[PDB]
A paper describes a structure:
Here, high-resolution crystal structures of the NHL domains of three of the four human TRIM–NHL proteins, namely TRIM2, TRIM3 and TRIM71, are presented. Comparative structural analyses revealed that, despite sharing an evolutionarily conserved six-bladed β-propeller architecture, the low sequence identities resulted in distinct properties of these interaction domains at their putative binding sites for macromolecules.
The TRIM3 NHL structure was determined at 1.7 Å resolution from the tetragonal crystals that contained a single molecule in the asymmetric unit, whereas the monoclinic crystals of TRIM71 NHL diffracted to 2.2 Å resolution had an asymmetric unit consisting of two protein molecules. However, comparative analyses suggest that similar binding of an RNA observed previously in DmBrat would be unlikely in TRIM2/3 due to the lack of a central channel as well as low sequence conservation within the pockets.
Numbering used by the authors: 469 to 744
The structure:
């Protein structure tokens, strides 16, 4: 009878355990997909938290995972992994079969990924501080950003989401802000500032956008999740009181309308109801 619906995971390297849980995504087929950067693996669960399967071969060769940070699920259920250390994005089948890698030689530190409304793969690079837009096949179609603190630049972007207008929503871990851009890279607006007040951050991480354009943002340093309207107005905190967060990372919205968070500091993921 809590905003918390369920919790899955504990510390370790076995199936249903985590060392460094970072990326979170959801499939329309009603699955939850999580990446562990330190166990170098992807784990797939039902919408109720039941373990389905784990995949990932450790290493630096194509097909293999070295530091998988960011994950996204395509409309066909393909699993898209940002590998920060291999410096590419791996696309797998919904069953964990390597298909191809995109952005090799262009991405220097791919951290976060999303899928847009035309099936483009959106990658945020924490080393070049840029946002890349690819076709599934690997073809680059767009790039914007650059290191800095101006509205068109990023200081250290780790996560990305796309809204109903195909607009790109980037969290800036080091700037304490969220910035929103057109599909073409045009800056639209920013919100958030450094602090603990409503609509302030101490290092934003995961981000998701709902069907109503509400933007949901995890706050790593403040161990909390904020919900905003489409203009970046604070609406609420997710009520985490029953089982507090500790350093949350990825965020995703499921097909059954729950917010799932990588509660990395507690070695688990948690699913929430939220009222919008």
């Amino acid at each position: 009878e809590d905003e918390l619906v369920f919790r899955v995971g504990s510390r370790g390297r076995e199936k249903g355990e985590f060392t460094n849980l970072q990326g979170v995504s959801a499939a329309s087929s009603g699955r939850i997909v999580v990446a562990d950067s330190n166990n170098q693996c992807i784990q797939v669960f039902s919408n109720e938290g039941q373990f389905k399967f784990r995949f990932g071969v450790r290493g630096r060769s194509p097909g293999q995972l070295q530091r998988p940070t960011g994950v996204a699920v395509d409309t066909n259920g393909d699993i898209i992994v940002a590998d920060y250390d291999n410096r590419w994005v791996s696309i797998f089948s919904p069953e964990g079969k390597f298909k191809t890698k995109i952005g090799a030689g262009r991405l220097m530190g791919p951290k976060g990924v999303a899928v847009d409304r035309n099936g483009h793969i959106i990658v945020v690079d924490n080393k070049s501080c840029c946002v890349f837009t690819f076709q599934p096949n690997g073809k680059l179609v767009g790039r914007f950003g650059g290191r800095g603190a101006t509205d068109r630049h990023f200081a250290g972007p780790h996560f990305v989401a796309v809204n109903n207008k195909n607009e790109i929503v980037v969290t800036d871990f080091h700037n304490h802000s969220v910035k929103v851009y057109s599909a073409d890279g045009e800056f639209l607006f920013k919100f958030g500032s450094h602090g603990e007040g409503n609509g302030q951050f101490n290092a934003p991480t995961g981000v998701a956008v709902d069907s109503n354009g509400n933007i949901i943002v995890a706050d790593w340093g403040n161990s909390r999740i904020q919900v905003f309207d489409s203009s970046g107005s604070f609406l609420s905190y997710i009520n985490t009181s029953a089982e507090p967060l500790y350093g949350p990372q990825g965020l995703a919205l499921t097909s059954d309308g729950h917010v799932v968070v990588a509660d990395a500091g507690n070695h688990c993921f948690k699913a929430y109801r939220y009222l919008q």
